[PDB]
Ligand binder design. Sequence first.
Ligand SMILES: [Ca+2]
Ligand SMILES: [Ca+2]
Ligand SMILES: [Ca+2]
Lengths: 437, 437, 437
Amino acid sequence: MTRLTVALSGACMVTRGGLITSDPAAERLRDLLRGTDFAVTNLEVVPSDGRGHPVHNAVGGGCLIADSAVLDEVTAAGFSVLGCANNHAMDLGTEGVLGTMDLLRARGIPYAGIGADLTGARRPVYADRPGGSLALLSCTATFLPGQEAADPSPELPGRPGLNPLRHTATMQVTADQMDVLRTIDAETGLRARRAEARALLGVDPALLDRLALFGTRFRTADAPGFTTECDPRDLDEIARWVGEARLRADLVVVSVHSHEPGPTPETPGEFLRVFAHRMIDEGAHAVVGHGPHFLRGVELYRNKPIFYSLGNIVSQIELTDRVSAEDYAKVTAERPLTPGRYYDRLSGHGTRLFAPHRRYWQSLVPVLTFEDGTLTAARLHPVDLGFGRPVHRRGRPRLADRAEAEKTLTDVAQLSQPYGTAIEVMDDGTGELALDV
Amino acid sequence: MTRLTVALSGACMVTRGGLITSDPAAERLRDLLRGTDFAVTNLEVVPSDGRGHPVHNAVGGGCLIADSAVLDEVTAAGFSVLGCANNHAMDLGTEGVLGTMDLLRARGIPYAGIGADLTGARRPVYADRPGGSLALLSCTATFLPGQEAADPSPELPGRPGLNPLRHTATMQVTADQMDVLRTIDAETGLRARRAEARALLGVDPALLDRLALFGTRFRTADAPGFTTECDPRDLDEIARWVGEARLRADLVVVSVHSHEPGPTPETPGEFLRVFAHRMIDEGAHAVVGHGPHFLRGVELYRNKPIFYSLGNIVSQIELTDRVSAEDYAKVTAERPLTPGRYYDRLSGHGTRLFAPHRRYWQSLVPVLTFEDGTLTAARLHPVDLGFGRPVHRRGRPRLADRAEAEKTLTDVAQLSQPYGTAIEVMDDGTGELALDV
Amino acid sequence: MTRLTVALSGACMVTRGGLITSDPAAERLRDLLRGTDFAVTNLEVVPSDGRGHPVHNAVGGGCLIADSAVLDEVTAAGFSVLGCANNHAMDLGTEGVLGTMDLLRARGIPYAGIGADLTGARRPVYADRPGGSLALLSCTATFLPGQEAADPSPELPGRPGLNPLRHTATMQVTADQMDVLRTIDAETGLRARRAEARALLGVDPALLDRLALFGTRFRTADAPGFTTECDPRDLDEIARWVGEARLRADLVVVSVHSHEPGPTPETPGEFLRVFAHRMIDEGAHAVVGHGPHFLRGVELYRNKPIFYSLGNIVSQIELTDRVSAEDYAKVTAERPLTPGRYYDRLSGHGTRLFAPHRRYWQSLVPVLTFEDGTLTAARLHPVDLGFGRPVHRRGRPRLADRAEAEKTLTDVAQLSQPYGTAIEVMDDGTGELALDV
Ligand SMILES: [Ca+2]
Ligand SMILES: [Ca+2]
Ligand SMILES: [Ca+2]
């Protein structure tokens, strides 16, 4: 009875206007987005009218701040529901995220992942349309510590921020390696410098055989290894809100931002896969991932899709018109630098970073078709971001032509093969997932 | 011709009123402070009327926020110049530090160490009195990353924050230990997870024989060791502002907040001693340190005093009326907790943390007498904070009685002995430094 | 692949509504402007809702302030990118230019040439359209000293203002004339009045054989002459921003406001020609000039056009409804004057100033067609401003009829002849530049 279509996309790092060019492929991408019931993208840029202060985010590539008019470029492109939890939503601080919320509400744009407190950032947003409703939840596993939102106490208010998916990594080492680490701790004098913390806490905070040194936790194992696990608090809370959202919407979509790689850059972290499985277990109809500037595999779990990374639907980092002083300080210069020259020198004039490689300039828009919560179709539309084009022209999305779409679909199928995912391929280069239903 | 007296003190963590009790010793402390030309303390608490949001500062003991009325308790006690750079000035964020600046300016209280940008936080404050002027500069080596203030760029404004004294620690390890660390990096799979960062940067960011892993830098040495060094940028900038301040004031006082211990908790970090020597080299008349909840040694360098830690002149952490939710979460509870019960359970009802030990409840107020920039006197006044008293009564300062003052002066002399500092002792328990001039 | 069209125009001094009349020629001008990708004009009037205070600008013809509704008359006419640097943007002071920026941003009108500081006034504005992007930079060589914008210092903010192109003029005189000037300096007693400036500076500021007297710099030469040179700071900075803008846009257009005449009123100043050559050397695709109330020549330099003066696309000075007191004081009167009567007496009731002469009421709209940065077409559309019409009807633009367009095109060709520019002429009176590409 209820038939709904949802368009998904990755990170949207838009800093300029004219997002949809006069190219018929870009206009067809816009027609595809406008033709669905819900089009979801994840705003990875702070829309600003001036409120806030730049935070030091050199580990995230610098501050990504743009004129608020870019919001109109998003909605006019066809997107209607925004996920806002990522490692850049706090680039202008708490004042910046409050201003972003104000801007989004003034334009009637439903959003999730950020709030005035932790609860508001964890809540789903309900987008209602004549055909039905979609609940969007947004979280991020990549962010600077302290940027997560906080709930109030009886005496103090909360803190504006993002919806966090924290995780801990543990280094498994052999007993001999462990004892060598303890010997390094003792002989260097590092242990001595915990003496006060010994007498105040009563015991060494490094001994919990487990160990904690250099801001990293080690554990004795038969063979060396590396494991990651989700924060139980965040996992349980996000799952609780997913279970809540299923009661109030036809479709529940969980968006997660995660740069964390697995054993190889193409594979997600183990904690992320556990998290996506948990989200589908609690009743989510789809899990859309992003973070990396490239595509990752697609997995069908309990007849629901998991897109571990859809890459970037928009990529205009080097075109931002506002570079902070701490970002400028990353490049030694004999004279003051303009933003474009700064970004040119930052990549060695295109010889480093994401420009020289092709996998960083392809993306994918999945269009999912559900009938009463059952996934009946999952079309895949490859997107070209303009690899090799000038910096001012690359990063704008368009439906890839047949050849490039076939190459992108091959990449996606290869990345999805370890999960047992199969893809039917159309003559135009688009495709769709093989379903069991 | 110009004769000036300056009273120094450590961290002032005031959260309640009635700072100066009806005890004649406390009133005599107030008379001592009011009797000098300048009385300097370092405000380690956010005075608030409601502006800002609590930041996660569990590593600093939680948020320390107090009613702005406590400012009147400081000035009425005799203090007239405030240093504000410490690990708690940003407990309410950038909005909180802006509100603190507004409150201090509305009450006519000169302050330094915080500003709307990095320059404003680095500037000295000039306190003018009929007898002459004092320039105060305030910085801190202990703070959460990102809390330092930032200067504007051509496109973006700065960021409100504190005046930073950053520093880096290096672990010297033998070549065999170094190779074991590299083997741990490789065999655990940690190196594999840098693969992307390898292809984007062109080289491994862990190889700079030096090494960088687990957020810590290691270097091959003949014998294991541990070294600390000041950030060259911060050292040079603070020295430049000290040289600037000498041109515009009779006396220049540099206040530094530093929890960092040396080989033993009583000794300062090597970087801190280098910093104090540099400050006196650039023309500072005194360097007053704080951070630890206990006293550290006193050193005479080029006939100028360096108080590495004056402890706390006020210590009312457990009496704060505003505990954040993230601070409450540090204590498991079967029911919601009130602030006092939270602090009681936080210390195991007085069996842990700073309460059981005496060195945490003594302090020192030095009164320095300069004549045309030459240190002619340096009286030491021991301060009792009420060890063993109830939690609501301990932490308020008073001039210690003869016995306790003698014990405190003995402690200070023992802590100062490695620097060659000698102290003459009065019959009342007070004393003064032996000078060469 | 990339094909873009840009419409250019001169100064837009609009003070009334109904800018596009019901005349089919005016509607065809509007259709021409709306039909291009970018239509650039230079707003020479302060749009005001009441913010600011009139500055004394009697040397610029008085204050030119208009109701902000005139902005809607500009955009509805077809213009989409505004240059704002001219000798009238500061007619309401710094508050006035801030209000103008607010008004332009509220209406979504891209602008350049003014900012809250010097950098913001020097930045290009990027207008994005489905077919591509255009970068506009705006500066002015005519303005009251002090009206240029200023950048902040570590202690003080900047100053809102215009983007300046300063220049210095030097009078070459023979050695005998030079010595006569020095003798006039000495014998009149003018040199004596520099005595204090002699003892404070250490040397006479008039002796730098060069000389500086009467606010003018003289230099000994074999034959008397007159030279002008650009300010090196402004030239280098504007060129730097042009080089920056080329990296981020398909087309870069530099708009310059300059009243300064050369040896004859029809010829530009030497500094202006050097500046335009420099702009094209740095990568500008076109240089559009304005300032004089008449047309100047067109020059093709390195296959890029330089329009030294496009005159006025709108000229409604005498129709302004707000005349300042200092402007009223320019006309002696027996009774208080209304604005229209003031402007009538100011021109001797049409017998003086710009009204009696025809070259002041013709203009030109060039439509340039670029293909991947290469100029492929440059159509010229003569514009009639209504010479001889009543004052309330003249100044509104319309496409000139065949006869008047032929006369205007002849004028433009004659003014362009010294630069080697040739023009093909259509049957309707319009034309296009002869290109080498
Ligand atoms: Ca990201
Ligand atoms: Ca502290
Ligand atoms: Ca003018």
